[PDB]
Structure formats: C-alpha cells, structure tokens
Design goal:
homotetramer, 119 residues, mainly beta, Lipocalin, Avidin-related protein 4/5 (chains A, C), biotin binding (chains A, C), secreted (chains A, C), glycoprotein (chains A, C), signal (chains A, C)
Chain lengths: 119, 120, 119, 120
Amino acid sequence: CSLTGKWTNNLGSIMTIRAVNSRGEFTGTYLTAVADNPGNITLSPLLGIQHKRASQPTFGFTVHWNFSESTTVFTGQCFIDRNGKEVLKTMWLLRSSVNDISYDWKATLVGYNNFTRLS
Amino acid sequence: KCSLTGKWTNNLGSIMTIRAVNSRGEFTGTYLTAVADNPGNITLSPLLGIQHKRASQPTFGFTVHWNFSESTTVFTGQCFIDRNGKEVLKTMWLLRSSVNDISYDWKATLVGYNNFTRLS
Amino acid sequence: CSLTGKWTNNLGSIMTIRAVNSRGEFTGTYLTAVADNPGNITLSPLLGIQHKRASQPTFGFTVHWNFSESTTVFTGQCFIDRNGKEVLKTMWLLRSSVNDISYDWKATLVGYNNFTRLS
Amino acid sequence: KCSLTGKWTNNLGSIMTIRAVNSRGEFTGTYLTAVADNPGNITLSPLLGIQHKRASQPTFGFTVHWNFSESTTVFTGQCFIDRNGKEVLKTMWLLRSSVNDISYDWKATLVGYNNFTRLS
C-alpha cells in the first residue's frame, strides 16, 4: 500500500500525492468538495509522512487551506484487501482560527474520511 | 507575529524542536515524547508540518513519524500571543496505531490535547 | 426522526432504544460487534437525551459496557431523506480505565458510526 | 472511592452539579456552561449519564442537552483520586451542532477536553 497517486473520498474530495521519499515524506495537492463557503475553494497543498517498511502503513499529513485561515490534519492507515484494492481509513481534525485563547474551545472539528484510488 | 521555529515543551513534558519556517509555511523538526506504551523504547522522532504565514496567530498542523513504533501522530492548533508577548501553542492530536487489518480499524485512533510553551 | 426502535451500524453492532420521554430522555440496550476481547461481549445499557421539537434532532448517549471498565459516548444527528429513510450520523469517544492520571493521554479512542433502522 | 455526586468546576469556569448516583451508576444533574456562541443566551441545562460503580477510579459518560440551542455535548472520562484524596475528572467531549441536512454533517462535531475539580 503506497500513498502516491490520485485519491477520492466519501465526500467527493480529491487529492494527488507525489512520490514518497526514503524517509516516507510526501507532498501533494488537495481539492476539498466541502467548505464553509464552497464558492471560495481553491487547491491546497499537503505535506506528510508515512511509514516505509510496513505493507499497510500508518501515515499523517497536513493540509494548509489556501482559501481560509484553517488547517486540517489527517491520520490513518492504508489497507490492501485480497484483490489488491487499497483504502485509506482516516480520521481528521480541522482547526479554525479564533481571535484569542478564550475561544480555543470551539476551534477544532473532528471527522472521518475513507479514500479510494481514482481508477 | 508567531513562528513555530524554536524549542517547545508541553504539559506532559515532551520537547520538540522546530527548524526554519519557509515561505510556504513548511517546517521540519524533531519531537522527543515523554510518553509511550514502552517509554524505554522512545527515540527522537521527525516531524513535518505547515503553518499559515500571514497571520499573527497562525493555525498549523504537523505529523510525527514515531521512529520506534508503527504509529503516527498528527497535531493541529493555533499559536496565540498574549498581551505580554508570551506564546502558547494550543493543540489537539490524533495518534494512529497500526492494526493487522481493516476489521480492527475502529480501535486504532486515540485523541487528546497538548499545550506548548517555549523552552526559553 | 425519532430514536425509538432498533438500529444497526456499519460495524454490525445493534442497539434498541425505548420510548423517548417529554424531556427527550431515553434508555436502551447496546450489543457491540467489536471489542478488545470479543468472546467477553455482553449486552450493555445506554442512557441519553435527544432534542424533542426538531425534526432532525441532535442527541447523545452513554454506553456503560457491562464486560469491561470502559465507557463510550455517542453524539450525532438523526436525518430523514426524501423517501422517509432515517440515518443516525454519529461520532464517539471510547474511554478506557487507566491506572492513574499520568496515563490519561492514552485513554480515549475516537471514531464514527452510521446507524440505520433494522427493517 | 470516586462518586460524581456533588458540584464541580472545570478549566473554562463552567459548573455542574451531579445528583445521587444510583446502584446502576446512573446520574442526573445540571450544567452551567461558561462558554457558548452567544453567552448572553446561556441557560442552565440538564445532564444524564452513567459511571462505573465498583471501580475506585471509575470511567463515566454523560450527555448535556443544551436548553438554549439545538446542540448536544457528550463528555467521557475518568475520576482519579490522588495520594492526598483530591479528585479530578479528566474528560474529553464532543459537541454536536444541528445542521440542515446530511451534506453538512462533516462540519457538525467539535472536539475538546475539560478537567474538573470539586467546588468545595
């Protein structure tokens, strides 16, 4: 299971991950299907690390949203079924920008996403 | 303005060191956790992340690839500057463990918080 | 959308929720399909509250696991599609018992579950 | 032994009052949050939960039905007793907002922590 390639998730978002280096580091581009103001969505860079030796590696990455002050992180594992089909099972945290520390409590959304490979 | 560059400790005693933040907001560093399932196996581990650049109190995220387990942690949060200029990173994290197959996926993700302040 | 009735989720767990009172309070019984030691699973009580007036209410409940020292909480919303079909979209936290406060960091798992009505 | 019965404050200044814990571990109470989207609309809200009974440091969960919004929060955690007999509730929470339809479900769930100690 390697992260390199093109992926879609259960919300219809897509991402492309470039080559994974010897340290497990990767870059890519994320197009979310969902946002607070969807008319404002632009492509956003991602940067992460996976484990290299594991056949079904865990990984994490950060998405710097280019159209808001927020940041999302994803972590999960790449699984391979008996037919060679890959799925990324992930959970995420979406951090919004708040004015000061007294508003921190309302700043972090949580959710899930399941990704499959595009063709 | 808040740059993540420098050394930080959190409420559990962990230390991380963040190198220069580039013009995209990308940064690398190391993380020495104070806690693990077997603290005797802990080793210094690499991190990689992105912060926002223009904001004075940026949000950010980073990934820690634990060098002593098959797990990965991601942190996200915001750097706040108080009226005296003191910086605090308020973060939440997800710690992903490796499981043997997808039937075990449900039990693989721990959640928590950490507050960081500067070492020095 | 009312919580009363019999439900299954995407992991194959089932639950039955009894009548919801005027305050939105409900009891029920939860059979998980998954656990650390699945051979030990027994039926476990749940207790929660939903909003009453809303057609698509938010709600929460606690499951006291009768076979371990852990507790799970679920929160989510009941949605009705155009055909009258209900789904509970939930997120959960599973709290394990740890020995003392220094282990608190490793005690809380997070996940999701989608529930649909049994027949 | 740790019973949730009594009054507690958390790190945000919120107060809750938990009534008698029954033989099943069930409890009701009230919660006065210090924080909300519009603090001027906050009202005292009911909670309902379950703790473990046999354990000296029980895990527990409860639901708060906010009486001034369409949201619901759930808390789960553990009551710890330290070597001097002081009790702390360590909790994590999920705050579910009401959204108009399932397409908005992704943005409906906030996560956080709270630490509680006794009022008195």
